[PDB]
Amino acid sequence: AVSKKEVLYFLSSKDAESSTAVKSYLKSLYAGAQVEATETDASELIAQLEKKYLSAQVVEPGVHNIALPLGESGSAPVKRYAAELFNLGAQAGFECPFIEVSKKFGQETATSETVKDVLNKTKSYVSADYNAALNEVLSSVEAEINGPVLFDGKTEGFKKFAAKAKAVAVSRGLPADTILAYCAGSANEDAADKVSKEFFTWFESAYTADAAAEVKAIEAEAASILDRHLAKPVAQIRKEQASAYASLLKRAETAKGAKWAEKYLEDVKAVQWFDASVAEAPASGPKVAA
Amino acid sequence: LTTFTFSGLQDAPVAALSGSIKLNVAAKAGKAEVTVAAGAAKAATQVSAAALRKLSGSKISLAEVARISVLHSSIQNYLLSLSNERYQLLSQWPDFTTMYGKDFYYRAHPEDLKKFYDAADEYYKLYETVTEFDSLSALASQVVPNYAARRRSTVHPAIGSTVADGAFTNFLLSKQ
Amino acid sequence: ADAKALDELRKPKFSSKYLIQHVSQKLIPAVK
């Protein structure tokens, strides 16, 4: 039972249980059913809350369909993984991640006038190794001026702070001039394209290093989990996993009437069907109706 | 794929590269007389110029049937490829069963023989736990929720430190 | 029975999606 705002998110979605709900909804609209009125109310706080809790319903079936490139050599499966995350973010309603984190920056420090409270209100959304390297530059400009350097653009203190911050940015490894000349725009399409290609080269290396860092975290977690598991004798492993499986079954079995409980138990029935169907003919895979 | 593709009978592969399957076409004006041989079965048919264009009309859309999910199966495949790297060094364990005879029992120190039998039981423990392969599907669900809540971001699923740092330069170094 | 479907078998199984649906159903009327 789709609620006319959930189905508007699943129209461009490409996973299974959302598209099946859309197909049932569109076959309902084929059999002479009216579409509900889309509600033009619920001022912007509830709007962004519904967007936040509705793009998660498109992201969460979409992450579990995206295979990690674990243990792979090369930047081609890492780029496959980051591209699938990009297509998932675009299906769920997000924009480019550059644009979305710039929007988070502009939404965070819209009412801050000093650079120090910009660095203290965008603290979570930047790395600590970069926030410290900006805080020391800000402290040096505070030693040079002995007055709070304001975040205006026409204030000259911000200019002599940014002239060091560009050197900080290029010494971190990211070309600040290429990024600024992309996101400012250019005169003709040739000198705009000449910096668009270089910003997309940096951006490709940026999200590829991001996905590679995520995959190295999952690889280290899998190695630590296995090396802690291979130190146990087998009976301890079997009783621990039967205890975990039974306790997480009964955590869904006590709660009854909800959608996630029946979906969990229908999924356990589907997993047991998969084990039976691979038992019936194991050299040909599971039986799919075709 | 897109809705309009433009491939077929034009800069196409006309001959095979493998000795296991032997394909050959007849590049005529419009049509093509193919002949394909894969072992003792043979097929030699004819495809029209407007017959490969309608091949990409219906889309295949290959999608995977997994036991739990493609994420969980990829994590479990990695855990199995780690179990193999442990198992390959349990494969190089020196054969202690050649020294079980009583001409090594009564020649050796009592404490060194107790140490040796403890080492053999330790090998049997390591080998019986590295080949508990059905526990990998439960270990792989101890990586799934932390990762899947990492991708449940308020910003973007594909976000990371480098993109946010580059856009923090773009936010800071532009005016206000 | 056996040979279920393909679009029924493309579902990622133990994904959340419904704890999210439960919170979005018990939060949005109560925050409105």
């Binding site: 936040k52 998660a56 979570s124 959304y125 930047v126 790395s127 860092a213 995520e214 190295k216 975290a217 280290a220 977690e221 190695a223 630590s224 296995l226 090396d227 802690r228 291979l230 130190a231 499986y245 997480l248 079954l249 955590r251 996630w260 969990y264 999924d267 356990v268 997993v271 | 036991r67 739990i68 969980h72 442990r86 060094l89 349990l90 390591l126 599907s137 439960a138 792989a140 669900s141 101890q142 799934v144 929720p145 899947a148 809540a149 990492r150 449940r152 971001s153 308020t154 910003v155 976000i159 990371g160 430190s161 946010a164 | 133990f14 959340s16 419904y18 704890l19 999210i20 439960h22 919170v23």
Partner: peptide
């Protein structure tokens, strides 16, 4: 094989905390 369902969001953007290498290869070679 089944996992605890979590419903929480990650607001901060951190480096993903690459964990330490365990000693299992060294201990089994020993």
């Amino acid at each position: 094989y089944l996992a605890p369902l979590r419903s929480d969001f990650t607001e901060e953007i951190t480096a993903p905390k690459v964990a330490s290498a365990s000693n299992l290869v060294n201990e089994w070679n020993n």
